[PDB]
Design a protein around this ligand. Structure first.
Ligand SMILES: C[S@@+](CC[C@H](N)C(=O)[O-])C[C@H]1O[C@@H](n2cnc3c(N)ncnc32)[C@H](O)[C@@H]1O
Ligand SMILES: C[S@@+](CC[C@H](N)C(=O)[O-])C[C@H]1O[C@@H](n2cnc3c(N)ncnc32)[C@H](O)[C@@H]1O
Ligand SMILES: C[S@@+](CC[C@H](N)C(=O)[O-])C[C@H]1O[C@@H](n2cnc3c(N)ncnc32)[C@H](O)[C@@H]1O
Ligand SMILES: [Cl-]
Ligand SMILES: [Cl-]
Ligand SMILES: [Cl-]
Lengths: 269, 269, 269
């Protein structure tokens, strides 16, 4: 595994995430390190998990996914090392961070990271991120056996985060805002491609209510892509993996209709 | 071409630009990927183009310049693959993005990217950036023949953006603000080294009017570098490739004199 | 030295720091380039120096530490190339930038960078950062002898920045805020592990006065890690290399108690 993909909440504005790569480089000088992001919101293990959901599929099987948003650092919350179905390794706090990454490619084997010989010593209690997660990630990239990191554990011993699921209701489908595509202000839902094919049939616009905004009701064209309506006009579309989203063509949807994650969305014919 | 240089408007604050590198890595595991920037303003194809202008000269001939600011994604606007005079390859939306990069090293051969075998399938209509641009960029880095991407097209079929040119007027030279050096607030013009050598002769300060600010007139020393005046004092200078600029020594010029791109600048003796 | 670690104040939001990597890649195509940060505050050579302090220890001996915050560019302030005790090379403005990096691993040999053959020609007076620092860094990574860069100089000819030291006073220890961990708002002091072991004995909370805030006095638990108090409650702790710090558990300390660097901190039993 010569590729190490690296995510955290330490930011990219100071030297911290780079000290981590320094440790990794020394351990695994044959390795390539690519940053996922270091801009996860601080302590926000669910934001990080969401960022990581599509990382398994996008990255080659020879990747180590090294991840650390670890406000539980220096406590009884351990680090885990996981082999997934794709053959990738993934290292991080057992705090639910890897939950959605594992939804895409389940755990096949899991170990708690307990061995001193895969840690950067002496381990600093406020930076398990660098001393255990990053170092272990580098040891594995460097050819270390997974079983050498510490004791096997059962996959149910991996902490999982609840994720709401969209459903059929009254006369359409009810889901919620999962996240915002912050670079553009597009809104992303948890509504899968399959649920809405009944109301996709007729070429007519759909009804969308967002209840968090004094109960806003929009009528909206279901589009393949942004360019299909006039600039600044709203659309509905399937985002880049298979969820319903809302945006304005070459404008910012949420600046116009201020939704947050959690907000309910119903679509109906 | 084992070097891939990567620019977009998707931002570096979430996992998106990294999923792109993931796709590329899988295709071209021998490749090095360096980010240009992922902070281009959203949909701002002219800002991206400006960022890319000096990239050809600075990068080695074995570079693939992979670029994607593509609000036309999933439409009749195609992706193009270009070999330039330097021998570099460049892949991106035919939307004017590569215009200024091509000013520095013209197109020698150009193809539209139409072949399924250089795309990451199935292609998502809202992310041609990842599925066509990035994948094609990776295929080429991986040794793929340029002609294998799709149909040759003539260089005039590459969309070009208008760029104003500075000129001789009344009693000096009239140009405009091209961009701001945002990290420092220095102002960059389109006034070439050659135009002002007549007023460079005498060692005297120059007159600079910026008409966008109720008609501001400054008298200003023409300097080699910032350090040549006292701290916080204004200067004129030739920036790092050969355009006239304005700044304060170890301060922020535009915070003091609020110009935007487009604003006219005349310099005279 | 096949690893080049790169820091500056040019930002990561435009193409500038990437043009630098372009130059380096062309010179040293065998090299790996990792960014330290490009977000140092503009012209802030002391902020950059602080960021660089722990870089020697974290990075392998085969690193070139290439660094450039150089508002003295195009003046009599020269660039220097240094071999340290660890065997690493370090290239940058002789402006105090490398001061704290050198505290961690002193200079063993030093040269001013004067030779044209390790510069990217022609050298632009406003970007010694790219044309001399980065290019030289790349030449050295590429196998160039250190002595080939220019004239040896004595280590006392390297400009050093003053750093306050914490001390014993009245009935405890008096130090100061060195920097803030900006991603989290934790406060970092210059108080070493060794000074406070006398008041560490008894398991009791400590007194901390911060005089810059109308004279704030907190009573505070000395902890190994954040998780040891309730969420949102304040702690004292030893940060990740051996200095006393203050934070809130999974909250932002400085947003609550607005300290800056320079502010005095006394701890006492
Ligand atoms: C200290 S930080 C990151 C590196 C840091 N800049 C350093 O040099 O020590 C390590 C982890 O601690 C957590 N963390 C940081 N500050 C914290 C605080 N005040 N409370 C709880 N967790 C914190 C973050 O989630 C982060 O993943
Ligand atoms: C969707 S984005 C980038 C990746 C995205 N974060 C994702 O995961 O799908 C792809 C391209 O779409 C364009 N784009 C994004 N949101 C848009 C909107 N509301 N209107 C028009 N173009 C948009 C951007 O210029 C960008 O280059
Ligand atoms: C010009 S800048 C960085 C590259 C720049 N974006 C470019 O393309 O030319 C080079 C160095 O100049 C210094 N610098 C930039 N603007 C300045 C100003 N107005 N006064 C003093 N120093 C400046 C910065 O500290 C920086 O390290
Ligand atoms: Cl950590
Ligand atoms: Cl796209
Ligand atoms: Cl410079």
């Amino acid at each position: 595994h010569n590729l190490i993909a690296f995510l955290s909440d330490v930011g990219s504005a100071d030297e911290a995430h780079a000290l981590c790569k320094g440790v990794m480089y020394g351990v695994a000088p044959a390795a390539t390190i690519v940053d996922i992001t270091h801009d996860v919101a601080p302590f926000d293990v669910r934001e990080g998990a969401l960022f990581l959901a599509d990382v398994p599929h996008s990255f080659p099987a020879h990747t180590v996914i090294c991840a650390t948003v670890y406000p539980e650092t220096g406590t009884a919350t351990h680090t885990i090392a996981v082999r997934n179905e794709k053959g990738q390794l993934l290292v991080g706090p057992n705090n639910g961070l890897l939950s959605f990454a594992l939804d895409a490619s389940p755990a096949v084997e899991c170990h708690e990271v307990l061995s001193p010989d895969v840690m950067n010593q002496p381990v600093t209690p406020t930076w398990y991120g660098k001393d255990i997660v990053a170092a272990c990630a580098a040891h594995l990239a460097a050819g270390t056996d997974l079983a050498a990191v510490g004791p096997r554990i059962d996959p149910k011993q991996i902490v999982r985060l609840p994720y709401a699921s969209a459903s059929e209701v009254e006369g359409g489908i009810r889901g919620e805002v999962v996240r915002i595509d912050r670079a553009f202000g597009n809104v992303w839902t948890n509504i899968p491609t399959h649920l809405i094919g009944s109301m996709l049939q007729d070429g007519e616009r759909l009804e969308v209510k967002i209840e968090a905004l004094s109960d806003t009701v929009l009528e909206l064209p279901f589009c393949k892509t942004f360019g299909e309506v006039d600039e600044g006009q709203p659309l509905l579309y399937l985002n880049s993996r298979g969820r319903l989203a809302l945006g304005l063509n070459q404008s910012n949807f949420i600046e116009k209709w201020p939704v947050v994650p959690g907000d309910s969305i119903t679509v109906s014919p």
